[PDB]
Amino acid sequence: EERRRRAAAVIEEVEQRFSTPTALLRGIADAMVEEMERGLRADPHAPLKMLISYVDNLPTGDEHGLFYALDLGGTNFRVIRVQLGGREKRVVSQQYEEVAIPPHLMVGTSMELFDFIAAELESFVKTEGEDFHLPEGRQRELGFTFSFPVHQTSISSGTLIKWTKGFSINGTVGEDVVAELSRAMERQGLDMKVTALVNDTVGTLAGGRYVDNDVAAAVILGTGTNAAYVEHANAIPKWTGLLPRSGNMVINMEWGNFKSERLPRSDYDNALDFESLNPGEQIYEKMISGMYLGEIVRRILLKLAHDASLFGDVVPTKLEQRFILRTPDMSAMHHDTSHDLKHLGAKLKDILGVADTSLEARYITLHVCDLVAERGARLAAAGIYGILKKLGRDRVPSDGSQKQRTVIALDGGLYEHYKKFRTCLEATLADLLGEEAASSVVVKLANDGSGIGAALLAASHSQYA
Ligand SMILES: Nc1ncnc2c1ncn2[C@@H]1O[C@H](COP(=O)(O)OP(=O)(O)O)[C@@H](O)[C@H]1O
Ligand SMILES: OC[C@H]1O[C@@H](O)[C@H](O)[C@@H](O)[C@@H]1O
Ligand SMILES: [Mg+2]
């Protein structure tokens, strides 16, 4: 039919707006670095907040003792505990428990959120076993990972700037996040002190360097996206105090808020942001992150189902529901290799509520997944490239000389579990770097590395007891 040429025009504008030629990706990485300079000088209306984390020393390995850690969590939260042995023994024992965050606790009362996470910590310590030991009359200490933007005022205190990725809890914005948790921990009859609070990009970087000395940055790709690196304290113009002893400082970029006119956006991105929980915010993240990838696919499939009767001569009701197509669903369809795409189609049945799909519709669906995941994974690589160019690792030494070994720790379910996304991320990064430079960059997987990373930073910041 013509219905066919109508569908072709839609897919063409998608592959036209989503187009990310390497040349454009270079300009975006350039813009990323200009925005990093902007945030470190505290330019007003800076997208990149570039927040001082007060982490001036990443873990050395001489960490010793018993420390707990709390990690929250865009979709989950975990309570961790480890007995750190020292330079030689290291981590002796380690236990953990992950709990899924109930959907209401993301949009309710902050007392409800922190009461829930503190009551799960309560029963977790109460099960403290035998290979963990706290010296007599000492107080247990907590490393707290907070995956949302926070304005830091010390290693263990900070103001919530805004909420992201699904959360919308009134009353916390502007309040100390550790004081809020501490209270809830008291309301639970629990004796614990939080000695280090850190983003989750900062936490992974800490836990990342504990097992690999060359880790220079950490990138998160889960329900949200963000990145942290180590910077030179002289390269931050808004620093006011007296420089750290190590001359280094970990910066939480909060790069999900990056916006640029070089970003390849479309009407599907405009509508998504318009109907979002935080409209206008987190523009970059809403093209990369797991919370938004499937939703972009659903909105493209919706244009096609309507302007092209792709799934029938009546748009399916389920397709009009926002966030009905989740990114792991998108992921499953994308990796279908069967000749007739029976597993993509079996997924479409559940999500659309249609009864069958044509083989052409399946192929169009598979192409939409490809275009959306590609744009996200390429732009994410362009961001990592920008970090490497901030640290001056986008190039090899001309001495000619030795080669640096630069490791970037990666964490999050999108990167860990979306295969194509992962290989497209790494291919583009190697493409963005030279063949020469790419042989010096390592993308390590440090799943949930903020859990222990926060406990390690709690160790170096003990009381001691
Ligand atoms: N199989 C998958 N394919 C694609 N994305 C996935 C998959 N599994 C999980 N994800 C993404 O990872 C996110 C979970 O990652 P995670 O790091 O564990 O938590 P957080 O929600 O804190 O970011 C999910 O929101 C989802 O968007
Ligand atoms: O989850 C990784 C990142 O996702 C972003 O949406 C949040 O603003 C960050 O606080 C977080 O570190
Ligand atoms: Mg996980």
From Swiss-Prot:
It is a single-pass membrane protein. Expressed in roots, leaves, flowers, immature seeds and endosperm. Residues 5-459 form the Hexokinase domain. It is an enzyme of class 2 (transferase). GO terms for molecular function: ATP binding; D-glucose binding; fructokinase activity; glucokinase activity. It catalyses: a D-hexose + ATP = a D-hexose 6-phosphate + ADP + H(+); D-fructose + ATP = D-fructose 6-phosphate + ADP + H(+); D-glucose + ATP = D-glucose 6-phosphate + ADP + H(+). Its EC number is 2.7.1.1. D-glucose binds at T164, K165, N199, D200, N226, E254, E285. Residues 60-198 are annotated as: Hexokinase small subdomain. It is found in: Plastid, Chloroplast outer membrane. The keyword Kinase applies. Keywords: ATP-binding, Chloroplast, Glycolysis, Kinase, Membrane, Nucleotide-binding, Plastid, Plastid outer membrane, Transferase, Transmembrane, Transmembrane helix. InterPro entries: ATPase_NBD, Hexokinase, Hexokinase_BS, Hexokinase_C, Hexokinase_N. Pfam families: Hexokinase_1 (PF00349), Hexokinase_2 (PF03727). Pathway: Carbohydrate metabolism; hexose metabolism; Carbohydrate degradation; glycolysis; D-glyceraldehyde 3-phosphate and glycerone phosphate from D-glucose: step 1/4. It comes from the Eukaryota. GO terms for cellular component: chloroplast outer membrane; cytosol; mitochondrion. ADP binds at G74, T75, N76, T223, G413. One of its GO terms (biological process) is response to glucose. Residues 199-448 are annotated as: Hexokinase large subdomain. Plants over-expressing HXK6 exhibit hypersensitive plant growth retardation and enhanced repression of the photosynthetic gene RbcS in response to glucose treatment. Fructose and glucose phosphorylating enzyme. Functions as a glucose sensor for plant growth and photosynthesis. This is Hexokinase-6. It comes from Oryza sativa subsp. japonica (Rice). The gene is HXK6.
